[PDB]
Design a protein around this nucleic acid. Sequence first.
RNA 1: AGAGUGUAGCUUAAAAGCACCCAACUUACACUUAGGAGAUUCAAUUGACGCUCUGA
Lengths: 217, 116, 45, 110, 54, 109
Amino acid sequence: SPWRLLGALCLQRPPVVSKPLTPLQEEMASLLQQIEIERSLYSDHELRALDENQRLAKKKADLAQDLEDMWEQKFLQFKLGARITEADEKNDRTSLNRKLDRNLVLLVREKFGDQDVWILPQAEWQPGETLRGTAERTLATLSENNMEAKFLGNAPCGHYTFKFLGAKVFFFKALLLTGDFSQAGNKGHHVWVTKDELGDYLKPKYLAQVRRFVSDL
Amino acid sequence: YKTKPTHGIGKYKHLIKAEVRAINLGTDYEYGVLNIHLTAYDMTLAESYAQYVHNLCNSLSIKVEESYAMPTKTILTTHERVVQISGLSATFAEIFLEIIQSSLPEGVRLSVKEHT
Amino acid sequence: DSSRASLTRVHRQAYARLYPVLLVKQDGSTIHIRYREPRRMLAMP
Amino acid sequence: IPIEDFITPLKFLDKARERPQVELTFEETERRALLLKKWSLYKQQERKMERDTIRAMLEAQQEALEELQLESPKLHAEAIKRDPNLFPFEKEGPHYTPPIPNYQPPEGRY
Amino acid sequence: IQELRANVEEERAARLRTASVPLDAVRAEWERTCGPYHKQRLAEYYGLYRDLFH
Amino acid sequence: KNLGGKSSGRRQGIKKMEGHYVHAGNIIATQRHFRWHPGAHVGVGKNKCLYALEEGIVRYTKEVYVPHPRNTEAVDLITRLPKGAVLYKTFVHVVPAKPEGTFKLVAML
RNA sequence: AGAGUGUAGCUUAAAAGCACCCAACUUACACUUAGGAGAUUCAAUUGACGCUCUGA
Ligand SMILES: [Mg+2]
Ligand SMILES: [Mg+2]
């Protein structure tokens, strides 16, 4: 039966910025703090922060604070980069730096003649071209950037077949170990969907059923 | 007794086993004995995630071999936490190595190193 | 679920009183580590 | 060499005398044990979400390998093949921040 | 059984292993439900049925 | 060069077979390793020998082996079998014949 | 559109028995101890809310 030879590429981006805790975790992150503190024994810091000042009032009966006021002046010194470089952009769906605590999947819009549907970046493959290199042929056919992707395997994930001449579309995988997104203002419409925007741009049962193997977390 | 129908009712050693190249024989393809290194500068965050991946292999039925450590380097001590793993399918080598990757707490570095 | 294995404690009994020290390795990649005399911002060249 | 560091530190023997004052209040042990309950309810679902995906991602992968088999029976012999280039595999854990500014690039390293 | 786990001081004693149950009250409820079916074992075990109702 | 090896047979084995009437203390089966385990009304010796404890009739059954928890050479075996497996040994019972005594009238006071 | 249907994850279970969660001992696992939550999808065997696919 005639299938239109077309795979896809569900790219994953690993978020490099850790998600901040829930306050329900933080009460337990406050409770796991103190129990770590009490169950110990005679630390080197308070051996030289307590027993010196009892001996110093002992000579006053007849310093580690300048350490403690200097070491706070390096935390106020080094300006922490925020977890939030996302609300200052807040529309920048074309940038990989759009959301930083969540994982990102590329989604380039295209156009057909008989249909007009937002798509995951496709792969018109050759039969004698293997399926795995077809995933490598996809990063380097349209976007032409130097995104350092690595892969998982030649296993598929989910076969979806919208037929008109049959079909089968093979949803593959990749991970952005790094990315050199040259000409980031490309001609296209690449939208970095975390998770919740899959129902915002991919409507049907053939593209809002990709969701069962994207990393929710 | 040997002449009886209940002969060998009490044999038990055939339910115990009382005593590596990669298994890709023709179609059944498995990985060899892996190592999932875990490294940080914390005694907790190097052992806490390496307690996780053991209990995740226990739930997802993967034959763990070892959970030892490497002796530290003076550079403040470097902590290494190495989980040996045998047994991965075609299908499972993806779903393991992603959820393992996606659940590292804080700057902890990974590995699919192997034996020798 | 990278908030899972981070909620923890030094499990040991022969353990000191350690403080949530912030460490940069090479490029501002700051992460928490338990460490004494809390200098509270670090780096390596 | 079978040398490690799971030994006890030899300087930790003598002056263990800091906090024998280990006593806790009766209503404070309510909320503390009410939290360790309500965290024990928390991690049960925090596990049960992950165990949902460990099936729900999985059954499609067998289904696609069934939907690879029927239409293309030469080629479900290469979905069971394995990659060699995972041998120095690595992913570092996520951080607090995008990395930095340009500079200031210093430590004394002793 | 949901309501008893809604009073907060009801589970105060429960986590201090020190709550109690009154045996007079359970008894006059025990014979309501299964106190008949418990007496059937006891009269079977004491051999009443195999002797007095054949 | 092969010396030794001249020992006589130890004459161990079943003394009282199944169905055989037994009196209390009659040795049922002398053994060197535990081949038959002691069942109801059957005791063990120091030399692993089975002797009857009541007057009755010797029966051999196959029973489910649950060892003692303080027996680690056979508990660490028990914690190694697959999840449906159950061990069986053969046991020697004595179904006691005579009752323990009857109430007899001694006097009419 | 329809066919199958459905006790919390499974039950040739009738509100249960295992899995499962967490804390303490464990190198970790395991064991054990302390704890933790769970359900008959509705209405008179029965018809309409949920899932799975057969089709468009
Ligand atoms: Mg001889
Ligand atoms: Mg002789």
